[PDB]
Every structure is written in C-alpha cells, then in structure tokens.
Amino acid sequence: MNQVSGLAGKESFILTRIELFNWGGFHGLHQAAIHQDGTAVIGPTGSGKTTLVDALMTLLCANPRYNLASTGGHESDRDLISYVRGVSGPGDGGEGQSHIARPGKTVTGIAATLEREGKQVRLGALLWFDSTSSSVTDMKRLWLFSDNPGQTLEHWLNVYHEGGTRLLRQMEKEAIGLWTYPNKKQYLARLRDFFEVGENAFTLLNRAAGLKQLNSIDEIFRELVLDDHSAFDRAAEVANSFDGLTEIHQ
Amino acid sequence: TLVDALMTLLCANPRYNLASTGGHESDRDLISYVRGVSGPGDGGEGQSHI
Amino acid sequence: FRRVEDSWREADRALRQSIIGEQYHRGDIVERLLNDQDALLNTPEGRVFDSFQQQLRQSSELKAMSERLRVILSHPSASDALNRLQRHDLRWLVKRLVDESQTVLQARARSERDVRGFMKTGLAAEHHRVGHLLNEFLNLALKLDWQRQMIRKQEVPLPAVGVAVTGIPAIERLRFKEVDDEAEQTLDLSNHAADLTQIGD
Amino acid sequence: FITPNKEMRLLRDHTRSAIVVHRRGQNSNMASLSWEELERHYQRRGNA
Amino acid sequence: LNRSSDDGVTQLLSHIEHEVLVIEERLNELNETMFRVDFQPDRYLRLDTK
Amino acid sequence: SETRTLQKIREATQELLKYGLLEEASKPNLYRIVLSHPEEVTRILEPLDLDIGIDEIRGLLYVKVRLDETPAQDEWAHPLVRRQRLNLEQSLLVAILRQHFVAWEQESGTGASQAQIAIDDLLPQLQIYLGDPGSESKERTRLLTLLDQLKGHGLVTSPDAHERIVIRPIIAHLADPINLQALLAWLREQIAQQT
Amino acid sequence: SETRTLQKIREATQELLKYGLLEEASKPNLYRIVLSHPEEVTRILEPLDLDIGIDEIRGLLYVKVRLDETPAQDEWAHPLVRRQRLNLEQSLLVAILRQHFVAWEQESGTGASQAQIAIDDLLPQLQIYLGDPGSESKERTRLLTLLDQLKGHGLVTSPDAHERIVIRPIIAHLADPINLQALLAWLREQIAQQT
Amino acid sequence: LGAKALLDPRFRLEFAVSVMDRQSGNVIESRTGSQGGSGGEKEIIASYVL
Numbered sequence A: 001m002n003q004v005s006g007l008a009g010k011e012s013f014i015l016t017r018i019e020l021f022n023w024g025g026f027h028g029l030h031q032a033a034i035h036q037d038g039t040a041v042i043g044p045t046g047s048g049k050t051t052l053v054d055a056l057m058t059l060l061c062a063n064p065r066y067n068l069a070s071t072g073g074h075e076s077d078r079d080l081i082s083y084v085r086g087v088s089g090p091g092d093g094g095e096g097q098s099h100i101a102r103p104g105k106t107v108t109g110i111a112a113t114l115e116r117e118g119k120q121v122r123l124g125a126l127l128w129f130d131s132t133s134s135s136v137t138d139m140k141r142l143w144l145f146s147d148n149p150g151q152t153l154e155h156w157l158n159v160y161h162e163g164g165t166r167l168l169r170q171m172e173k174e175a176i177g178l179w180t181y182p183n184k185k186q187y188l189a190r191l192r193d194f195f196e197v198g199e200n201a202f203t204l205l206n207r208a209a210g211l212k213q214l215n216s217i218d219e220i221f222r223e224l225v226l227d228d229h230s231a232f233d234r235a236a237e238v239a240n241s242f243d244g245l246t247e248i249h250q
Numbered sequence B: 001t002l003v004d005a006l007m008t009l010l011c012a013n014p015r016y017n018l019a020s021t022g023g024h025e026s027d028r029d030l031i032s033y034v035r036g037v038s039g040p041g042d043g044g045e046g047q048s049h050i
Numbered sequence C: 001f002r003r004v005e006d007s008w009r010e011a012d013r014a015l016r017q018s019i020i021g022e023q024y025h026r027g028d029i030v031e032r033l034l035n036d037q038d039a040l041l042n043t044p045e046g047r048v049f050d051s052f053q054q055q056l057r058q059s060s061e062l063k064a065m066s067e068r069l070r071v072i073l074s075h076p077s078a079s080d081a082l083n084r085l086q087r088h089d090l091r092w093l094v095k096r097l098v099d100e101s102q103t104v105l106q107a108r109a110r111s112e113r114d115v116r117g118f119m120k121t122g123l124a125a126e127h128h129r130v131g132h133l134l135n136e137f138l139n140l141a142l143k144l145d146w147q148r149q150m151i152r153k154q155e156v157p158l159p160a161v162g163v164a165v166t167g168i169p170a171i172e173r174l175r176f177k178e179v180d181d182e183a184e185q186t187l188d189l190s191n192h193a194a195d196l197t198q199i200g201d
Numbered sequence D: 001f002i003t004p005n006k007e008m009r010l011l012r013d014h015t016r017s018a019i020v021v022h023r024r025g026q027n028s029n030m031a032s033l034s035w036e037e038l039e040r041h042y043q044r045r046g047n048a
Numbered sequence E: 001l002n003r004s005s006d007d008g009v010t011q012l013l014s015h016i017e018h019e020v021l022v023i024e025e026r027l028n029e030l031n032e033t034m035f036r037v038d039f040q041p042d043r044y045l046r047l048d049t050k
Numbered sequence F, G: 001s002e003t004r005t006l007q008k009i010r011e012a013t014q015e016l017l018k019y020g021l022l023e024e025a026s027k028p029n030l031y032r033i034v035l036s037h038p039e040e041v042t043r044i045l046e047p048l049d050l051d052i053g054i055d056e057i058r059g060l061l062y063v064k065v066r067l068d069e070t071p072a073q074d075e076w077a078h079p080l081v082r083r084q085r086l087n088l089e090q091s092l093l094v095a096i097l098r099q100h101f102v103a104w105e106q107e108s109g110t111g112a113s114q115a116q117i118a119i120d121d122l123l124p125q126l127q128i129y130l131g132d133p134g135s136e137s138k139e140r141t142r143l144l145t146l147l148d149q150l151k152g153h154g155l156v157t158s159p160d161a162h163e164r165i166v167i168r169p170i171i172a173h174l175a176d177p178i179n180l181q182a183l184l185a186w187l188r189e190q191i192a193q194q195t
Numbered sequence H: 001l002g003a004k005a006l007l008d009p010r011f012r013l014e015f016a017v018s019v020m021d022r023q024s025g026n027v028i029e030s031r032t033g034s035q036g037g038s039g040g041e042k043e044i045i046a047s048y049v050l
C-alpha cells in the first residue's frame, strides 16, 4: 500500500502539523499531527472540523470563504473577526445567540508546518486586539515565514509578551532564517515565488471543498478551472468614441 | 427509475430525476424510459444506446 | 508601436497647447486632426502600422506566420537556440501584437475626443469673459521658468477667502495621560488533549 | 479527508491516522490517534 | 470616421475570438495529463469541445 | 442682562469659523441661521477684522478678511488665519479647475455641485507647464500634493476611489475675474522681474 | 448704519486669542486695554462661547471657555477648541515643573519673582525616574525638546543665558492637577520600588 | 428583490418560528441557538415544518 504514496516525501512538500492558539472555539494551545500517508478528521457535527479546515486556509489564500462546504452558493456566515474573538454565535448553546470568550484585549495566533525530507518551513501569523473596539484596524497584524527550527508560535508568544512588535522586528533583524511582513500582499508573493506557481492555483484549492454543489462538467470549466478574460468594459468603451465622432459629423 | 415510474401516476407534471441536482433542474424526459435508452450513446451513429 | 504611441501623445499635447491659444477657428481644430491622421502614413513606423491593420481584414498571412513559427519551433535544435521563455512568447506572437495594438488606438483616442470638447461649448455670456481671461492667464504663464520650487512657492495677490479659523490655544485643551494600570495576559501553554471517555455510541 | 461520523468503515481502509475533535459546552479539544490506539480504546469502552 | 471606428470594431472581434484559440490550447495539457492514468482497467478520459 | 448671543447663532457661527465656509446644500440649518442674522455674523466678525462672504446662487457662505481702518495691508498677515499664502503652482491648478468648472457650468448651470475630473485628466493639464518628472507615480505625487493643500483651503474634495475630485462652489470667488485680472497684472510684474 | 468696534479692543482680543495667554510684563498696554474693556472683550468672545481668565497677582491674562454650564460633556469638548492628551513623559515633566513651581512660589513669592529653574536642576528630577539616557547631550536634547513642546503649550520659557527657564503663571491655572498629584505619587512609588 | 417585494405577495412579509411550552403555552426561545458544525443541525426545524 505504501507504494501509492512512494512519490510522497521525495517530490513534494507536505502538510504535517498545525499549531493553534485562541482560534475559533479553541483556547490555549492545541496540536494535531498528520501522518505522511494522509488522514481523516473525525468528531460529531458541531465539534471543530470546519473550524480546522478554515484555520489552515488563511495561510494559503487571500480570500477565505469560511464554511464553504455546507454553504456553497451564498456568503459565509462567518468572518475573521468572529473567529478571532471566539464568537460562538448561533452555536452559543443557549447563551444569547452570541457568546463571546475573547471580547477584551486578546492575542491570537496560528502556524502551519510544511516540510520536505526534514526541511522545515513554517507559515505563521499573529492577530491581537488592544480594546473592545472591533474595527478592521483595531486588529493589528504580523505574518511570519521561516525555515529555522527555532521559530514557533509557542516561542513567538513569549517574545510578544516580552516586548511589542518592535521586539519581534528586532528578533527578525538580529536572528537569521526569519522574515516578517506587515502586508499580506508581499507575504503572498513570498509564497508564490517559492512554490513556482501563479496566483490562480492557490485560489482554486480554496474551492475544492465546494465539490458538493456540482451540476455538471459544464460548470467545472466555467467557474473554477478557467480564469477570466472578459471584455464587457472594453466592448462598452468603443461605443463611446463612435458616438463622439458621429457628434462631430452632425 | 422505479420512483420516477411511480411519480408519473400521481403528478400533473412530475420532475423526473430531481434528486440528482438538489432541486435545480430535471435531465430526463418521459419517452426515453419507454424507449429504454441506456444513456447517451457514442456519436459514431450509435444505435447501441436504445 | 510604442513609437507610434509617442507620436499620437505628442500630437495630443500640441493640439491642447494650440487650443489654449485664442487664435484658431473651429475649422483649424477640426482640420489639424485630419492632417495628423495623414501625417502618420509617412514614417516607417506609420507605414508598418497601417500595413498591419489591413492584415486583419484580409487575414492572408496572420495564419501563415503563426503556422510557420509553429513549424520552426518544432525543430529540436531550436531548444538550444532560445531559452524557454523566449520560445513560449514567440509561439503566441500574433496574440501579443493584437493586444499591444490596443494601446495605440487609445493613444490616438484622446485627440479624437478633444475636438468635440471645442465644438459644443462656444464661448458665451459671462462664461466667454471668464474663459478668455483664463486663457490669457494660461498663455502668459508659459513665459515663466516653472522648474524653480521657490518661484512656484512665490506668494500671490489672491484674496484670502473661506478663511479657516480654529485651534484655539486654550489651557483647558491640555490634558495629561489618565491611566497607570499594567498587567499581563499570561501564557497558558498547557498541553491540552482530548478525553476519549467523553463521547457516546 | 474531512467527514462526519458516517462510514468510518471506508476511511479505516485508506488511512493511517485520525484526528478526533471533542465538543463540550464552549471548549473544544482534539487529539491525533493511530487507528490501533482508537481500536484499543474502543475495546476498553467495551470494557467500560 | 469609418477608418477609426472600423479599426476599433475589428481590434475587438479579433481579441474576443483569439482567446478561444488559447483556451483550446490549455485543454491539450489536461488531455495530456489524463492520458497517464487508467480511469477503468484499460480506459482513459479525454476532453473535446464543440 | 448678559450679552450672550442666542445658542443657535453661536452654533452656526462656530461651525462657519471652524471650517471657514458653509453650504446650504450640506448644512441647510446653519446656513439659514447665518442668513437669518447675517448682520450678527458681520458684527461678530467685525471685532475680529473679518467679514462674511455670501453667494446664494450657489447656496454658499464663506469668511473673508475684513478691511480695518487699514485694509489689513497684506491681509494674509491677519493674525487669525491659520494657513499660509497661495503660490504660483496652486494658482495654475486653480485656474485649470476653474476652467473645467465654467465648462461644466455652461453645461449644467452654476448652482449645482456635480462637476468632476480624474487624476489622469488633471495630470496632462499641469504636465504641460511643469515638465515631466520622469515617472507617472512622481507626477501623481505632485498632483496629490497640490490637491491635499487645495482641499486644505476648501477648493476641492479628497481624491476618491475613482481618482477624481469634486469642485467646490467657493472656487467661483477665489477665481474672481477681477482677481484674475489683478493676478494677470501681478504676473506681468513677475515678467518684469524675469526681465 | 452703526458704529464699529474700537480698534484697540479688537487688536488686543485677536492677539490674546492667537496667543491664548499673555503678560503685562510682556505687553502691558494690551493688558491694561483689555482690563479696561472686559465687558467688550467677553461680548466679543461669548458668541464663540469663549471668555478670558486673568491673574493680576501674577500679571497674566488668558482665555477660558464660556459654554452653557456643565452639559453632559463634563470632559468638555468645544468646536473651536481641539483638546489634547499628553503622553507619559510630557505629563511627567509637567508634574516636575508643577512641584518646583509650587516650591518657588513659597520661597520666591506667588509670581512676584517669575518662577525659574536651571536645566541642570530639572535634568536630575527627570533622571530620578527615567535614569541616565546615555549622555549629557542626550539629557539636554530630551529636556529641551520637552521644554519646547511645553512652550508651544504656553507653559514655560526658553532657558536664559544661564540655562534657566521661566515658568509661566498659567501652570497655576491648570484645571485638575489631582491627576498630576496621583501620577507623581505613582512615579515616586515606582522609582522607590525599582531601585 | 425590490421589485419582488413590490409585486410578489410572498416578499411582502417575513416569517419566524417560536418554541412553545406545552405546559404553560409560553415562549422559551425564538432562535435556534444550538446550531452549528457543518450546518447539519438546521435541518431539524426545517424538515419538521415541511
């Protein structure tokens, strides 16, 4: 049976271990491992599976469609804010349809651990609030990208307590094999350049989950696989110049 | 197919094969059941699909 | 094609410059554009471009060129001749030229839209006087050497209207910090794990 | 593969480990187990 | 007027179509990939376009 | 007893002072309060050597330096005004904006406020005068630097998502044809300086 | 139609508004003119909901808000007045200056001799809590930047030829220094603990 | 949807469901504050009402 995955290990990078802290309906630290031959995630509906799926998604895509699997067709009932604040919402279990476990000043982090043949490479983020204000700007941000075994959320939290973002940036400057970025755009470029793929693939992956909602092959090559090259704006534009020139004529 | 057959009797215009698209649209017609069509055959003149 | 774009941008610039001039009839404006259109059927660049444009209407060669290029790139030794990106780009020559030509048409467009800007709003009423004064000012401004910052910063006699008055320096406006608390949201790295004795049948 | 409880039988045939996710009020926990450990713990549940 | 507007209306309806001759080139790669895997014990898929 | 002015009057005058102009289309209540006691506004600005400008055709109210027994000399030396003085490039862009404003006015009338142009529309209009910096981003920086200040004077809105701006009606008076002729004479003096 | 406001009253009121606070020892003529026309000045300022506070003992005049008494905005806010909230170090230096000004007004009179202190005297007080920044040049730069910022706040003067500043009387006119007292108690407690 | 509301009777009004106490006849809750997971809990009330 091992031969079906004999390609693995050798060729591609792999996803093995997911560190979580104060994400979704989880508190403190939590860990999972993924065996080099695949794995299933199990538990009663309402436990965490969609939460974990989404929790990995942030690192790879710029537009997380949270909770797509049960909702493909309409907008997600959830967002980055709700998860980070630990809002149970309708899943309150009777707690005023809201329940909020981290409303005040709080810190949240995530870190996935890709690798190949022992070469660790870690994609991690940190999101935190200073007050009950829940503006988009209130959430201060910082990504991570490292291939040094000495870096982990389990470590980065200690420094974040030891000092502000200046201290983290100082660690980045002093240490080696570590980079940080306040903008996700440059970080996503830092991904694409490493993995030698455009900006398309790492999106389609985020619509793999929506397979439940297929009508026919006729869609898979009209909404997911093919990119967009439409020209409604251009086609509209030419009609103008024609009218202006007719105006000169008249 | 069995449920489709029964449904032809109770309904004014039953929507055959509905549960294949969640509630969106019907694919088959009535006649192909009588003709016993075994799906869409090959385009090389076919005739093996009926 | 970029060179042709340069010519059309320059023509647009000159046409606007001249429009700011007060001396042209409507005929002058509407005729200079046709003179430009016939101006760019002379240079090698214009010859090239107008020759190409027809070669979409009568698509004789724009299959032959791609086809033969496909033939050449099918030869093995070509791999050594060109790096991979060169070959990929060359294989789609026709498309990239078609999509590049889109830039020039717009680069001519601007001038194709300017003249309509003069036919309609014939100067009249107080607008005539205001526009003529503005045109005089603009024309006179040309004489200056505008490169010097200090000159561009030189203060003008325009009247101070719509004056913004605010920001009174009152003592009451001053307040000090109003908190001194401090505490840490300690790190709870307790290694949690699931408890398999808790879920049912 | 994610999947609800149903047809664990199939996934036991094409995997080497599984992750359980527990729900309890508003605290949710999870563990990574090989199939053999899960089988032993089921046997103990049978002993429970 | 004719020359300019006509060049425009042609530089569009070349561009629109010309894309199709790129979509019909990507599908070769998938038909290339799907030739390496047996869908059924001695069958393989392939994609075509009307 | 006390000379306390009516609270609504104080509100309207304080707002007008805070922003230096007041449009009925935006804040009709304060505008009508001002035009209900315009002599009060005058007699309050008069202590400050300031005066109220009024243009009801565009539904606009703005404050302007008054003439003291000395006509404020160079009125820009008035103690209260917080801003600097206008300069050449600002006047150039003001003239171009007023040109577009008068065109739009002939097109749709004077009282409305829907006029607009885009960043790329402005960029050639000034690039003709200012030379080419060498990159599009640099000329955009130039234009935005000018626009920030001109907004600081209330002439224009902030750059929108479409990279356009809305002309404020007050420009009708900064670009007064009498003031334009005076500025033309001043420009002739600048020519004499160049001479 | 009717008379204008007297020139000197207008000029003095505008001067004070520009400066916020002024001294008889600085401009005695305007000081006397305003104090001879307080009704006129307040009538000029009450439409703005502003007014003036004075201290003849220390010879200082200054502005003051005159809104309607105690609205819900007890932490008041006024249109024409943008308020400020100083930082840790700014208010720290303010507390230092307050304590030494309190001492001076006892050992040198309530403004009879303008409150003074040397740079080399303020610097040790800051060093009590902040410690040595790294060099004497750094100490002087820190204290001088802070003193300049407070001078922009109208609280202190620049050091004299002997590096001695003069404390403006306005320091005695702060609203709620109880916060300063609590802050200074906290600072002394912290340094006592952190030594 | 605006035209729908203007013309469709169905879009002129909105619907909701209350949990009723069989004993007192009182309402305890009007919202499914116990739903979540992969959305598999909403099916209860919907299926019951259907």
Ligand SMILES: Nc1ncnc2c1ncn2[C@@H]1O[C@H](COP(=O)(O)OP(=O)(O)O)[C@@H](O)[C@H]1O
Binding pocket: A024, A025, A044, A045, A046, A047, A048, A049, A050, A051, A052, A077, A078, A082, A083, A087, A088, A089, A090, A091, A092, H035, H036, H037, H038, H039
């Ligand atoms: N905004 C929300 N609304 C409802 N439930 C939420 C929300 N955010 C988080 N949750 C909770 O997080 C979990 C999401 O369900 P999950 O267990 O991830 O789904 P499944 O395992 O069925 O794929 C549930 O416990 C759900 O109640």
